[PDB]
């Protein structure tokens, strides 16, 4: 049972990874390769009114 | 350091998350049963021994009898209002005593006491 | 327990905004430093250092810069 199940990750490294993942969404090119049908949406990143 | 049967007793803290959740639930239950009052008693401001740490100021068990007397109340009555009282802690610093008295006075002003009935 | 603070690191303890304005009393005890040691020479600006122990050579640089040392009790 004492096998290493969890892995320690630096807070700064995790923040960098999250920032990179967020940035990749606005490229509009990686999204198509990711397997999302974003060909029909008007623009990327998509912003919707606060009423949503 | 593996000359013993340590393999028989290998405590792995898999429970961390569940224990934290249980502690939070216990705190919520205490709040439900102690809603009007704070979950923790008002602790005094004290200076640390072990000169390596004397520069640090940290909380303590409870105010001394002299501090309670100077605060305008009594030790027996102070406990019912949640004020921690220490009967063995002696006062040896005027600066700390004044700060404790001011803290007790502020606490007395911030508290509102419902009728006994 | 006798942590040593270099004279070069001494200026780092002062806040950055206040350091520029100066370029003052420094509580080295609150910073976790017990003894003060010198390694170079600080700029010729008066400085007041509160510490329990100070090196003679560090005191030489402190006096050359016009600073003073305060001893606790």
């Amino acid at each position: 049972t004492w096998r290493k199940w969890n892995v320690k990750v630096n807070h700064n490294e995790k923040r960098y990874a999250t920032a990179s993942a967020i940035a990749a969404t606005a490229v509009a090119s990686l999204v198509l390769a990711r397997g999302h049908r974003v060909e029909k949406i008007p623009e990327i990143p998509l912003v919707v009114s606060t009423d949503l | 350091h593996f000359r013993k049967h340590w393999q028989e007793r290998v405590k792995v803290h898999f429970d961390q998350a569940g224990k934290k959740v249980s502690r939070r639930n216990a705190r919520a239950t205490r709040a439900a049963k102690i809603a009007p009052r704070p979950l923790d008693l008002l602790r005094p401001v004290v200076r640390a021994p072990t000169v390596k740490y004397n520069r640090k100021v940290r909380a303590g068990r409870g105010f001394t009898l002299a501090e309670v007397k100077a605060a305008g109340l009594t030790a027996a009555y102070a406990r019912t209002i949640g004020i921690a009282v220490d009967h063995r802690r002696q006062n040896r610093n005027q600066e700390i005593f004044d700060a404790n008295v001011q803290r007790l006075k502020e606490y007395q002003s911030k508290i509102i006491v419902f009728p006994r009935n | 327990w006798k942590p040593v603070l270099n004279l070069d690191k001494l200026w780092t303890l002062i806040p950055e905004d206040k350091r520029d304005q100066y370029l003052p009393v420094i509580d080295t005890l609150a910073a976790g430093y017990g003894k003060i040691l010198g390694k170079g020479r600080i700029p010729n600006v008066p400085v007041i250092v509160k510490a329990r122990f100070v090196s003679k050579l560090a005191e030489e640089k402190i006096r050359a810069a016009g600073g003073v040392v305060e001893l606790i009790a």
Binding site: - | - | D8, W11, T12, L23, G40, P43
Partner: protein
């Protein structure tokens, strides 16, 4: 006798590609030296102190020279002043970058330095001590 760097950073790969192209199409020894230094590992790429950069700039006639660092530029509190000159490094630390900006200098990337000096003219290469670490 090195083929490609062991790093997996895409931006580092692009920088290596650009520097190899420049060195092959210009035969300038500066580009070859920069490319060779790029392949150096992290342990073989010690950081360069900002105080070291200031010392190099204080050298005879080095004030006009532009300093190029293949490693990481680290701030140094030993000096409260820094000569106003352009500094180029692979990545700039927050403290070092802030000090350079306050001192009137500049912090440009390796690609910007190559664009400004395709042949390495007016450049200067500094590397941190190697035997110091262990």
């Amino acid at each position: 006798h090195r083929t490609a760097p062991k790093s997996d950073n895409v931006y580092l790969k692009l920088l290596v590609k650009l520097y190899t192209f420049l060195a092959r199409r210009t035969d300038a020894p500066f580009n070859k030296v920069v490319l060779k230094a790029l392949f150096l590992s992290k342990i073989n790429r010690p950081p360069v102190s900002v105080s070291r950069i200031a010392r190099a700039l204080k050298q005879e006639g080095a004030a006009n020279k532009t300093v190029v660092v293949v490693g990481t530029v680290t701030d140094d509190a030993r000096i409260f002043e820094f000569p106003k000159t352009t500094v180029a490094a692979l990545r700039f630390t927050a403290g070092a970058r802030a000090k350079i900006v306050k001192a009137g200098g500049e912090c440009i990337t390796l690609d910007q330095l190559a664009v400004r000096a395709p042949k390495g003219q007016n450049t200067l290469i500094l590397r941190g001590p190697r035997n110091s670490r262990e």
